[PDB]
Design an enzyme around this catalytic site. Structure first.
Site, PDB file in Angstrom:
ATOM      1  N   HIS B  61       0.805  -1.255   0.000  1.00 59.21           N
ATOM      2  CA  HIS B  61       0.000   0.000   0.000  1.00 59.21           C
ATOM      3  C   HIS B  61       0.816   1.272   0.000  1.00 59.21           C
ATOM      4  O   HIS B  61       0.353   2.311  -0.443  1.00 59.21           O
ATOM      5  CB  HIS B  61      -0.902   0.027   1.258  1.00 59.21           C
ATOM      6  CG  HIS B  61      -1.896  -1.079   1.283  1.00 59.21           C
ATOM      7  ND1 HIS B  61      -2.725  -1.360   0.208  1.00 59.21           N
ATOM      8  CD2 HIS B  61      -2.182  -2.003   2.235  1.00 59.21           C
ATOM      9  CE1 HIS B  61      -3.501  -2.390   0.504  1.00 59.21           C
ATOM     10  NE2 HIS B  61      -3.193  -2.799   1.730  1.00 59.21           N
ATOM     11  N   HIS B  86       5.558   7.492   5.967  1.00 57.01           N
ATOM     12  CA  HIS B  86       5.195   6.759   4.719  1.00 57.01           C
ATOM     13  C   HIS B  86       4.582   7.752   3.711  1.00 57.01           C
ATOM     14  O   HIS B  86       4.554   8.965   3.995  1.00 57.01           O
ATOM     15  CB  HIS B  86       4.210   5.667   5.028  1.00 57.01           C
ATOM     16  CG  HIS B  86       2.922   6.190   5.565  1.00 57.01           C
ATOM     17  ND1 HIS B  86       2.649   6.287   6.900  1.00 57.01           N
ATOM     18  CD2 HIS B  86       1.834   6.688   4.916  1.00 57.01           C
ATOM     19  CE1 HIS B  86       1.418   6.775   7.081  1.00 57.01           C
ATOM     20  NE2 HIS B  86       0.981   7.062   5.883  1.00 57.01           N
ATOM     21  N   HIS B  88       2.219   8.721  -0.101  1.00 58.62           N
ATOM     22  CA  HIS B  88       1.096   8.497  -0.958  1.00 58.62           C
ATOM     23  C   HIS B  88       1.303   9.296  -2.273  1.00 58.62           C
ATOM     24  O   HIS B  88       1.883  10.376  -2.233  1.00 58.62           O
ATOM     25  CB  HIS B  88      -0.182   9.025  -0.328  1.00 58.62           C
ATOM     26  CG  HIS B  88      -0.563   8.354   0.958  1.00 58.62           C
ATOM     27  ND1 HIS B  88      -1.403   7.228   1.037  1.00 58.62           N
ATOM     28  CD2 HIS B  88      -0.248   8.676   2.231  1.00 58.62           C
ATOM     29  CE1 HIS B  88      -1.578   6.883   2.299  1.00 58.62           C
ATOM     30  NE2 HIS B  88      -0.901   7.749   2.993  1.00 58.62           N
ATOM     31  N   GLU B  92      -3.008  12.916  -0.687  1.00 62.11           N
ATOM     32  CA  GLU B  92      -4.283  12.569  -0.123  1.00 62.11           C
ATOM     33  C   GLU B  92      -5.086  13.840   0.098  1.00 62.11           C
ATOM     34  O   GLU B  92      -6.255  13.916  -0.310  1.00 62.11           O
ATOM     35  CB  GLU B  92      -4.109  11.787   1.192  1.00 62.11           C
ATOM     36  CG  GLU B  92      -3.414  10.441   0.970  1.00 62.11           C
ATOM     37  CD  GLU B  92      -4.011   9.337   1.819  1.00 62.11           C
ATOM     38  OE1 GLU B  92      -3.641   9.253   3.011  1.00 62.11           O
ATOM     39  OE2 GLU B  92      -4.872   8.588   1.300  1.00 62.11           O
ATOM     40  N   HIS B 105       3.494  11.351   5.218  1.00 61.84           N
ATOM     41  CA  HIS B 105       2.847  11.323   6.509  1.00 61.84           C
ATOM     42  C   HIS B 105       3.796  10.818   7.573  1.00 61.84           C
ATOM     43  O   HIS B 105       4.327   9.726   7.455  1.00 61.84           O
ATOM     44  CB  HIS B 105       1.677  10.400   6.491  1.00 61.84           C
ATOM     45  CG  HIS B 105       0.548  10.879   5.669  1.00 61.84           C
ATOM     46  ND1 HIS B 105      -0.487  10.069   5.251  1.00 61.84           N
ATOM     47  CD2 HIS B 105       0.279  12.114   5.200  1.00 61.84           C
ATOM     48  CE1 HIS B 105      -1.379  10.808   4.609  1.00 61.84           C
ATOM     49  NE2 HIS B 105      -0.917  12.043   4.554  1.00 61.84           N
ATOM     50  N   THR B 172      -6.309   7.315   7.295  1.00 64.96           N
ATOM     51  CA  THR B 172      -6.785   7.293   5.889  1.00 64.96           C
ATOM     52  C   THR B 172      -6.821   5.913   5.260  1.00 64.96           C
ATOM     53  O   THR B 172      -7.169   5.753   4.083  1.00 64.96           O
ATOM     54  CB  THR B 172      -5.980   8.208   4.951  1.00 64.96           C
ATOM     55  OG1 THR B 172      -4.636   7.739   4.790  1.00 64.96           O
ATOM     56  CG2 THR B 172      -5.908   9.636   5.530  1.00 64.96           C
TER      57      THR B 172
HETATM   58  C1  LIG Z   1       0.023   1.545  11.907  1.00 56.98           C
HETATM   59  C2  LIG Z   1      -0.440   2.883  11.345  1.00 56.98           C
HETATM   60  O1  LIG Z   1       0.125   3.929  11.651  1.00 56.98           O
HETATM   61  N1  LIG Z   1      -1.506   2.857  10.517  1.00 56.98           N
HETATM   62  C3  LIG Z   1      -1.905   3.887   9.668  1.00 56.98           C
HETATM   63  N2  LIG Z   1      -2.996   3.806   8.840  1.00 56.98           N
HETATM   64  N3  LIG Z   1      -3.298   4.972   8.077  1.00 56.98           N
HETATM   65  C4  LIG Z   1      -2.404   5.986   8.358  1.00 56.98           C
HETATM   66  S1  LIG Z   1      -2.482   7.556   7.692  1.00 56.98           S
HETATM   67  N4  LIG Z   1      -2.564   7.390   6.019  1.00 56.98           N
HETATM   68  O2  LIG Z   1      -3.668   8.109   8.182  1.00 56.98           O
HETATM   69  O3  LIG Z   1      -1.201   8.042   8.084  1.00 56.98           O
HETATM   70  S2  LIG Z   1      -1.186   5.465   9.548  1.00 56.98           S
HETATM   71 ZN   LIG Z   2      -0.781   7.985   5.172  1.00 56.07          ZN
END
Ligand SMILES: CC(=O)Nc1nnc(S(N)(=O)=O)s1
Ligand SMILES: [Zn+2]
Ligand SMILES: CC(=O)Nc1nnc(S(N)(=O)=O)s1
Ligand SMILES: [Ca+2]
Ligand SMILES: [Ca+2]
Ligand SMILES: [Ca+2]
Ligand SMILES: [Ca+2]
Ligand SMILES: [Ca+2]
Ligand SMILES: [Ca+2]
Ligand SMILES: [Ca+2]
Ligand SMILES: [Ca+2]
Ligand SMILES: [Ca+2]
Ligand SMILES: [Ca+2]
Ligand SMILES: [Ca+2]
Ligand SMILES: [Ca+2]
Ligand SMILES: [Zn+2]
Lengths: 222, 222
Positions: B61, B86, B88, B92, B105, B172
């Site tokens: 992902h 991480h 995207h 977003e 993020h 998200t």
């Molecule tokens: C383990 C963890 O942190 N899970 C997450 N899931 N969505 C995220 S977000 N896109 O909102 O940063 S982080």
């Molecule tokens: Zn994220």
């Protein structure tokens, strides 16, 4: 069967039915202790009320005054029509850790059903003449409703100074639905000790949901 | 089985399992189109990061960079520890109806598990030196993780101008849990077209949840 007290009381609402799940898992619940505030450049709320209160109902949880269509507020450029106003004692919201003895809620809905509630704190003071008109006719028992002799204008229950606190919250009784715009007036109104006593006596106890955590939220002040 | 595409895609997340109920009934979901903004007197976010990135994972992902303990931010007087960052593509969050091609993020958790995420937009531009270190070793398939040769300081991926947008939102990806503090930096960072292309190629498609309604919320700007 939800109540303000005992085994069907606020801490258990979320276990009563599936439809009350927000009362349990919600992170944007109301009311709150207004104690994380930031100054913000908010616009004044346009309040376009006319005399429209028609009936007074005792539903066992509050005294609720119905309003006829045509009165509205504007928030975020959207029209929310006044449906009803009702009361709680003591106040549902707190302000820096303290209650007021009474709080009024003015409940509005846009054309898609999104809700906006104006909250007004009331302190002990001089007898409120508008509330006197409603209190004179207040139904004693749950399920009773009475027509008002003369149409009351809810605007008379709002302060003249219209600075406000704003946050994103919920309905304060089940199902405690989220996505609710809360507008809480900074300036308190006044009513008599006797008026407060009468409401409490009829209700039979406190009618406030305990404050809920703010979590990620901030309260914005105009 | 949740995905960014098709029959298990974002519009259906809430129907996949009971635990993903927020993805369906939530009124405070992320991301959002940042388009109802109010100036607010917010405090600067204290960012106390040290060099701590250890590993890079492809989870199918996103590309996720783990961080060792000891780095934190302060929000509302509370310490939130940096767990991971991480990516995207495209962004977003939108800004007045427009995407950026990429968004990072930075995910933080306080001692009770409350979450705060810092979002950073990236625009196409000059190659990012810090991202080059991660990209050089990026795992190409889901389930593969690699250790970084040298520790990276996430602070180097944040703008020097630290003005931000703040709102109360959600994760998200499922379960899309609410009660999340979002801090979205006003200033965009930069990366090369090649870097964006590589991330996209590896991911195999867009990795963004569609924007969700604001509902009762405002976005505050520092
Ligand atoms: C383990 C963890 O942190 N899970 C997450 N899931 N969505 C995220 S977000 N896109 O909102 O940063 S982080
Ligand atoms: Zn994220
Ligand atoms: C039908 C209806 O309006 N229900 C309400 N439930 N709680 C409300 S309150 N205390 O949040 O204003 S209004
Ligand atoms: Ca001030
Ligand atoms: Ca003021
Ligand atoms: Ca003030
Ligand atoms: Ca004043
Ligand atoms: Ca005052
Ligand atoms: Ca007053
Ligand atoms: Ca401005
Ligand atoms: Ca700037
Ligand atoms: Ca600025
Ligand atoms: Ca800029
Ligand atoms: Ca920049
Ligand atoms: Ca700006
Ligand atoms: Zn109420």
């Amino acid at each position: 069967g939800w109540s303000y007290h005992g085994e069907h009381g606020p801490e258990h609402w979320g276990d009563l039915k599936d439809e009350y799940i927000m009362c349990k898992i919600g992170k944007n619940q109301s009311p709150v202790d207004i104690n994380r505030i930031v100054d913000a450049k908010l616009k004044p709320i346009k309040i376009e009320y006319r005399a429209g209160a028609t009936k007074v109902l005792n539903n066992g949880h509050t005294i609720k005054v119905s309003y006829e269509p045509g009165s509205y507020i504007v928030v975020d450029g959207i029209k929310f029509e006044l449906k009803q106003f009702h009361f709680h004692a003591p106040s549902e919201h707190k302000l820096k850790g303290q209650h007021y003895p009474f709080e009024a809620h003015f409940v509005h809905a846009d054309k898609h059903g999104n809700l906006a509630v104006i909250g007004v704190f009331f302190k002990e003071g001089r007898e409120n003449p508008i509330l006197e008109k409603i209190w004179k006719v207040m139904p004693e028992n749950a399920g009773e409703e009475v027509k008002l002799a003369h149409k009351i204008n809810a605007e008379d229950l709002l302060p003249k100074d219209r600075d406000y606190y704003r946050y994103s919250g919920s309905l304060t009784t089940p199902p405690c639905s989220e996505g609710v715009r809360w507008i809480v007036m900074e300036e308190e109104m006044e009513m008599s000790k006797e008026q407060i006593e009468k409401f409490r006596k009829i209700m039979g106890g406190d009618t406030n949901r305990p404050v809920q955590p703010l979590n990620a939220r901030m309260i914005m002040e105009k």
